[PDB]
Design a protein around this motif. Sequence first.
Motif, PDB file in Angstrom:
ATOM      1  N   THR A   1      35.868  35.238  28.881  1.00 13.38           N
ATOM      2  CA  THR A   1      35.608  36.064  27.711  1.00 13.38           C
ATOM      3  C   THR A   1      35.821  35.278  26.429  1.00 13.38           C
ATOM      4  O   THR A   1      36.979  35.063  26.040  1.00 13.38           O
ATOM      5  CB  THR A   1      36.527  37.275  27.728  1.00 13.38           C
ATOM      6  OG1 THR A   1      36.331  37.989  28.945  1.00 13.38           O
ATOM      7  CG2 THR A   1      36.220  38.198  26.531  1.00 13.38           C
TER       8      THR A   1
ATOM      9  N   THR B   1      46.011  37.033  30.839  1.00 13.15           N
ATOM     10  CA  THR B   1      44.755  36.661  30.197  1.00 13.15           C
ATOM     11  C   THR B   1      43.894  37.866  29.872  1.00 13.15           C
ATOM     12  O   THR B   1      42.815  37.670  29.315  1.00 13.15           O
ATOM     13  CB  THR B   1      43.940  35.706  31.072  1.00 13.15           C
ATOM     14  OG1 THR B   1      43.498  36.392  32.245  1.00 13.15           O
ATOM     15  CG2 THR B   1      44.742  34.479  31.479  1.00 13.15           C
TER      16      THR B   1
ATOM     17  N   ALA C   1      35.160  43.738  35.605  1.00 10.69           N
ATOM     18  CA  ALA C   1      34.007  42.917  35.977  1.00 10.69           C
ATOM     19  C   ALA C   1      32.701  43.650  35.692  1.00 10.69           C
ATOM     20  O   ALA C   1      31.868  43.169  34.922  1.00 10.69           O
ATOM     21  CB  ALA C   1      34.086  42.514  37.455  1.00 10.69           C
TER      22      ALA C   1
HETATM   23  C1  LIG Z   1      34.799  39.924  33.060  1.00 12.82           C
HETATM   24  C2  LIG Z   1      35.887  38.892  33.298  1.00 12.82           C
HETATM   25  C3  LIG Z   1      36.387  38.151  32.229  1.00 12.82           C
HETATM   26  C4  LIG Z   1      37.375  37.185  32.422  1.00 12.82           C
HETATM   27  N1  LIG Z   1      37.822  36.486  31.340  1.00 12.82           N
HETATM   28  C5  LIG Z   1      38.789  35.551  31.542  1.00 12.82           C
HETATM   29  C6  LIG Z   1      39.349  34.752  30.445  1.00 12.82           C
HETATM   30  O1  LIG Z   1      38.919  34.902  29.285  1.00 12.82           O
HETATM   31  N2  LIG Z   1      40.298  33.864  30.733  1.00 12.82           N
HETATM   32  C7  LIG Z   1      40.780  33.641  31.975  1.00 12.82           C
HETATM   33  O2  LIG Z   1      41.667  32.774  32.125  1.00 12.82           O
HETATM   34  N3  LIG Z   1      40.330  34.322  33.044  1.00 12.82           N
HETATM   35  C8  LIG Z   1      39.371  35.274  32.880  1.00 12.82           C
HETATM   36  N4  LIG Z   1      38.922  35.971  33.997  1.00 12.82           N
HETATM   37  C9  LIG Z   1      39.486  35.604  35.306  1.00 12.82           C
HETATM   38  C10 LIG Z   1      38.548  34.471  35.755  1.00 12.82           C
HETATM   39  O3  LIG Z   1      37.213  34.938  35.906  1.00 12.82           O
HETATM   40  C11 LIG Z   1      38.867  33.834  37.115  1.00 12.82           C
HETATM   41  O4  LIG Z   1      39.061  34.847  38.088  1.00 12.82           O
HETATM   42  C12 LIG Z   1      40.113  32.989  37.038  1.00 12.82           C
HETATM   43  O5  LIG Z   1      39.793  31.921  36.157  1.00 12.82           O
HETATM   44  C13 LIG Z   1      40.554  32.481  38.420  1.00 12.82           C
HETATM   45  O6  LIG Z   1      39.515  31.741  39.039  1.00 12.82           O
HETATM   46  P1  LIG Z   1      39.874  30.527  40.020  1.00 12.82           P
HETATM   47  O7  LIG Z   1      38.717  30.168  40.895  1.00 12.82           O
HETATM   48  O8  LIG Z   1      40.455  29.395  39.243  1.00 12.82           O
HETATM   49  O9  LIG Z   1      41.095  31.118  40.923  1.00 12.82           O
HETATM   50  P2  LIG Z   1      40.900  31.929  42.313  1.00 12.82           P
HETATM   51  O10 LIG Z   1      40.406  30.969  43.364  1.00 12.82           O
HETATM   52  O11 LIG Z   1      39.994  33.113  42.179  1.00 12.82           O
HETATM   53  O12 LIG Z   1      42.373  32.418  42.664  1.00 12.82           O
HETATM   54  C14 LIG Z   1      43.479  31.971  41.893  1.00 12.82           C
HETATM   55  C15 LIG Z   1      44.800  32.279  42.586  1.00 12.82           C
HETATM   56  O13 LIG Z   1      45.259  33.566  42.183  1.00 12.82           O
HETATM   57  C16 LIG Z   1      45.661  34.337  43.324  1.00 12.82           C
HETATM   58  N5  LIG Z   1      44.638  35.370  43.701  1.00 12.82           N
HETATM   59  C17 LIG Z   1      43.290  35.248  43.681  1.00 12.82           C
HETATM   60  N6  LIG Z   1      42.669  36.386  44.092  1.00 12.82           N
HETATM   61  C18 LIG Z   1      43.629  37.274  44.378  1.00 12.82           C
HETATM   62  C19 LIG Z   1      43.661  38.668  44.868  1.00 12.82           C
HETATM   63  N7  LIG Z   1      42.515  39.344  45.124  1.00 12.82           N
HETATM   64  N8  LIG Z   1      44.871  39.232  45.047  1.00 12.82           N
HETATM   65  C20 LIG Z   1      46.018  38.575  44.795  1.00 12.82           C
HETATM   66  N9  LIG Z   1      46.055  37.305  44.351  1.00 12.82           N
HETATM   67  C21 LIG Z   1      44.917  36.608  44.124  1.00 12.82           C
HETATM   68  C22 LIG Z   1      45.821  33.321  44.441  1.00 12.82           C
HETATM   69  O14 LIG Z   1      47.105  32.661  44.422  1.00 12.82           O
HETATM   70  C23 LIG Z   1      44.727  32.336  44.113  1.00 12.82           C
HETATM   71  O15 LIG Z   1      44.963  31.086  44.749  1.00 12.82           O
HETATM   72  C24 LIG Z   1      37.923  36.947  33.808  1.00 12.82           C
HETATM   73  C25 LIG Z   1      37.430  37.699  34.881  1.00 12.82           C
HETATM   74  C26 LIG Z   1      36.442  38.671  34.666  1.00 12.82           C
HETATM   75  C27 LIG Z   1      35.926  39.456  35.847  1.00 12.82           C
END
Ligand SMILES: Cc1cc2nc3c(=O)[nH]c(=O)nc-3n(C[C@H](O)[C@H](O)[C@H](O)COP(=O)(O)OP(=O)(O)OC[C@H]3O[C@@H](n4cnc5c(N)ncnc54)[C@H](O)[C@@H]3O)c2cc1C
Length: 356
Positions: free
Chosen positions: A162, A235, A356
């Motif tokens: 975002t 976040t 989302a």
């Molecule tokens: C509309 C929208 C806007 C967003 N805006 C931002 C933003 O501005 N800034 C920001 O930093 N992020 C934001 N996010 C979150 C972002 O999209 C990602 O999900 C985040 O960056 C994690 O992605 P990743 O692949 O690095 O980690 P992931 O691989 O998805 O997981 C990270 C870790 O968190 C834990 N985890 C993951 N999924 C789960 C679950 N279902 N239950 C429990 N624990 C879990 C686990 O330890 C995992 O290893 C937003 C999400 C949405 C949907």
Amino acid sequence: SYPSYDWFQTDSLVTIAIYTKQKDINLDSIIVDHQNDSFRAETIIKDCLYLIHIGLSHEVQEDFSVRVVESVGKIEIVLQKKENTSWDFLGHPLKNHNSLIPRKDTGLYYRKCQLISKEDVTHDTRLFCLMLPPSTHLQVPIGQHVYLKLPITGTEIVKPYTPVSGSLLSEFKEPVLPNNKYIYFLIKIYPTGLFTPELDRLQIGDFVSVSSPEGNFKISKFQELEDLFLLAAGTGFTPMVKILNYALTDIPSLRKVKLMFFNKTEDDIIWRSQLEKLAFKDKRLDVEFVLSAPISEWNGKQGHISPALLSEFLKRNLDKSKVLVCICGPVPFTEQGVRLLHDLNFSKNEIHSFTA
Ligand SMILES: Cc1cc2nc3c(=O)[nH]c(=O)nc-3n(C[C@H](O)[C@H](O)[C@H](O)COP(=O)(O)OP(=O)(O)OC[C@H]3O[C@@H](n4cnc5c(N)ncnc54)[C@H](O)[C@@H]3O)c2cc1C
Ligand SMILES: NC(=O)c1ccc[n+]([C@@H]2O[C@H](COP(=O)([O-])OP(=O)(O)OC[C@H]3O[C@@H](n4cnc5c(N)ncnc54)[C@H](OP(=O)(O)O)[C@@H]3O)[C@@H](O)[C@H]2O)c1
């Protein structure tokens, strides 16, 4: 009464004119991408998307201009010819040219943006600054997100983020610009994540693919607002950044903005110092920090979002006012929060939950 387009040329310029037939069109309604020889303009028209997609007859320069005649929703895209010679036709239409399609049924379009800077904000959260290419016009409206896309071995991976303002403080804020080339993000890096460790490995000057914006937040929810409440965890702060700047600058009827920001530890309070100075120098803003798991002496509130905490924070004043509560965070935090706001007699129209 459907949208349409035309074009004309001078010795050195090619102008494309888009006739939306709509009131309310502005520079946020249109996204333009082009290569030396290919041109894509998508225009937001109510819930539909009107696409112009053409391969140009000759090459044009990187810089172009985009202008809106707001009375009639005419948009003009002015391209610069590389060579001052006459064109025989505009070009060959490409995929979905002159198509009008509901937004729900459209796919994400990407372009490459350059990583310009990265700054530590907390121990695991960075401020990223990406720069759009000179050949793209793209504005991300308040409350909306974009998808970032990176290549890994075998494939590409995508996550939404975002965009935020570069600062909450006027001395560091950008001015209002005819067309901003820079996009800022606050992004928390999870060591066990898939996307954010790869994002955190990107070097300054490398490129990240950025999608067009997505999201249903409508800025009209701010018309005549008097009291704004913001509930953010972690976040989930990020949509609040632009909302907070807008609240303090673009709502003359605003009496109060209150932020209740939930985190784990003192070291996770994104932009604590900036929020404290903003709140101290503007009596319209109150900020309260709640910590679920403090590690040092903490005089402030503790815990998680609860029926108790929102009773005091959202306590009804004696006079009726136009109110909005925005909430963003982990999904259960937001689902619980919205359930708790209905219990407190806030309507759907008085709640926006960023999800989302
Ligand atoms: C509309 C929208 C806007 C967003 N805006 C931002 C933003 O501005 N800034 C920001 O930093 N992020 C934001 N996010 C979150 C972002 O999209 C990602 O999900 C985040 O960056 C994690 O992605 P990743 O692949 O690095 O980690 P992931 O691989 O998805 O997981 C990270 C870790 O968190 C834990 N985890 C993951 N999924 C789960 C679950 N279902 N239950 C429990 N624990 C879990 C686990 O330890 C995992 O290893 C937003 C999400 C949405 C949907
Ligand atoms: N528009 C959007 O959809 C959007 C935009 C931006 C961010 N987000 C989401 O916001 C989330 C923030 O993640 P984060 O890692 O920054 O948060 P975090 O630091 O791990 O946790 C933030 C705070 O929320 C609390 N919390 C977590 N789960 C909870 C639950 N089920 N009920 C009540 N409180 C809870 C935590 O308490 P504990 O100490 O017990 O863990 C902590 O105080 C991400 O999931 C991201 O996808 C969504």
